[PDB]
């Protein structure tokens, strides 16, 4: 059924079921591992709005959860605290055990509102939402995560194979061609956002208007 | 497409066993300073094929999770191992 | 006693893999139209013995669940498999 990857002579192969190995003795299980991977490696437009475009909502489907043992650093983590504009929550709480993605570089924390037509928040292409050593089909309320995927692997019997910035936002529409965005520096000072703006550029703007108020 | 041949990761020290007494919780760290942070600069196209592999694997993975009632799966690799055993025995 | 030799069931498509892109959740069905609905008209006394078998199995099954603290068991068949392995190896 499911694929699985191997490491023979420090390089890669692939085999579902039928490809024998009279070589890989599979000495134990600690070499057998499962690995997450972020999509930043694929190099998508990792701005804020496309995220909203890369996602969606619906209902009738549950959440599901899975375990991996290791992943990748995050140049763009994401957390959300959103309510429907009536005042009710969009998202469900994060259950016990789950915690934010531990190892971030730019936490794109957000609040805002919008019609959350759907009691859960899936990825559009069917990606994951990568928490501490865990993935989901969906997002949980008020918790850091990252986008990524998973693979499963075998290893041979030789070896094994920090600031955490905060960033804030506001927005509306939120799953719409009318979706709005804003960037925080202060209580009051905000700005209309563009896809151009990087974390570094906005971090720089924590000096410009940080001086000019 | 784009692909980062380099890689930097955050494994756990499940073993390695470079351990004194800090294994105890009460005197141990909370949740951090615990994940080893290993780097990598090996074969470049290796990891590109790897990222590819994961992106492909996603499909059957979702079908699997869809195809149960479990919330928090933990039983995959054990199942794969025993499958391999049968496939050899 | 009474026994329905016919049978009609609701399996899942755990595999079968007649899959396009609907494997994704966001564009997939909710929880229905997902279970295959296979029919059966094979040997008649087969399924009667089968129903019998389940009714017998109930006993040890309850003893097992009684004999743990787990709520939501999922580990049976893996245990049976590995038992068979030992029984052969």
């Amino acid at each position, epitope marked *: 059924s499911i694929p699985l990857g191997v490491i023979h002579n420090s390089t890669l192969q692939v085999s579902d079921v039928d490809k024998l190995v009279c070589r890989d003795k599979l000495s134990s299980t600690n070499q057998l591992r499962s690995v997450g991977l972020n999509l930043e490696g694929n190099g998508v437009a990792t701005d804020v709005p496309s995220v909203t475009k890369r996602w969606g909502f619906r209902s009738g489907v549950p959440p599901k959860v899975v375990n991996y043992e290791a992943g990748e650093w995050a140049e763009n983590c994401y957390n959300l605290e959103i309510k429907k504009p009536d005042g009710s929550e969009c998202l469900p709480a994060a259950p016990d055990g789950i915690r934010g993605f531990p190892r971030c570089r730019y936490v794109h924390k957000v609040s805002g509102t919008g019609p959350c037509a759907g009691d859960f928040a899936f990825h559009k292409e069917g990606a994951f939402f990568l928490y501490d050593r865990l993935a989901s089909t969906v997002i949980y309320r008020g918790t850091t995560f990252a986008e990524g995927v998973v693979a499963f692997l075998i290893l041979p019997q030789a070896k094994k194979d920090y600031y955490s910035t905060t960033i804030r936002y506001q927005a509306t529409g939120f799953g719409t061609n009318e979706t709005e965005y804003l960037f925080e520096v202060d209580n009051l000072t905000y700005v209309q956002l563009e896809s151009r703006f990087t974390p570094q550029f906005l971090l720089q703007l924590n000096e410009t208007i940080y001086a000019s108020g | *497409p784009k692909c980062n041949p380099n890689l930097h990761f955050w494994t756990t020290q499940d073993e390695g066993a470079a351990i004194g007494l800090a294994w105890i919780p009460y005197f141990g760290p909370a949740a951090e300073g615990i994940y080893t942070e290993g780097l990598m600069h090996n074969q470049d196209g290796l990891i590109c094929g790897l990222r590819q*592999l994961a*992106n492909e694997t996603t499909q059957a993975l979702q079908l699997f999770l869809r195809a149960t009632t479990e919330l928090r799966t933990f039983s995959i690799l054990n199942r794969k191992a025993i499958d391999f055993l049968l496939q050899r025995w | 006693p009474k026994c329905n030799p016919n049978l009609h069931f609701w399996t899942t498509q755990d595999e079968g893999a*007649a899959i*396009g892109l*609907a494997w994704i959740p966001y564009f997939g069905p909710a929880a229905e*139209g997902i279970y295959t609905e296979g029919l059966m008209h094979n040997q008649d006394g087969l399924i009667c013995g089968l129903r019998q078998l389940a009714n017998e199995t109930t006993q040890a099954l309850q003893l097992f669940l009684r004999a743990t603290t787990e709520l939501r068991t999922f580990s049976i068949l893996n245990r049976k498999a590995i038992d068979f392995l030992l029984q052969r190896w």
Partner: antibody
Amino acid sequence: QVQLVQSGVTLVQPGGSLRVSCAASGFTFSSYAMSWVRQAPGKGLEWVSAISGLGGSTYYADSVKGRFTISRDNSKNTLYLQMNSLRAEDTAVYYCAKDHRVWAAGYHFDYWGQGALVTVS
Amino acid sequence: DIVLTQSPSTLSASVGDRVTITCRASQSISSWLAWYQQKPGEAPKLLISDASSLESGVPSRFSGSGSGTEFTLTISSLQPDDFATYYCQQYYSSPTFGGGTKVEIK
């Protein structure tokens, strides 16, 4: 650039067998997946089976499950297909076809091989 | 498990006209549909991905749309080259085809 090479045609008796080989060039043969579709004369199309971009995942139509065995070779920039136990219905033009998308998604096909009008008697 | 329905079966029409073709299914589908062309002997060609995303190197006359089960394909200002046979490839749950759609002149 994308240069499929559908092999020539051969007659095989009923119940026989065959190994097709479609070759390709013009891109990264590994980054994309392939498949097979058939068209009997005076007929429409019919998907046969498909493969991952690397060979892990296979997918077969129900009508030919087990009868046909797909395979490729990334190193040789080559596709294959092993088949057996063949009936008369299998008489058709089998095409090696490439996807639009990349990385073993997007079953919808970009290119089309030349086809080979396989026969049974 | 799913089945399509090309409609009309064909057409016998002339240049410059505009034509739409329909394509139905037994079950609801998103914008995960495609279109093709091929001629009596020719290897086929792709036209649209997702039911609206036109392909490269194709005239802009080619256009279609829909959602759920009903799906369209509208082309104005026809040509001789446009008079191939066309097809409608599901790829939601299984890469399904159907009866195809032929074109000709009076």
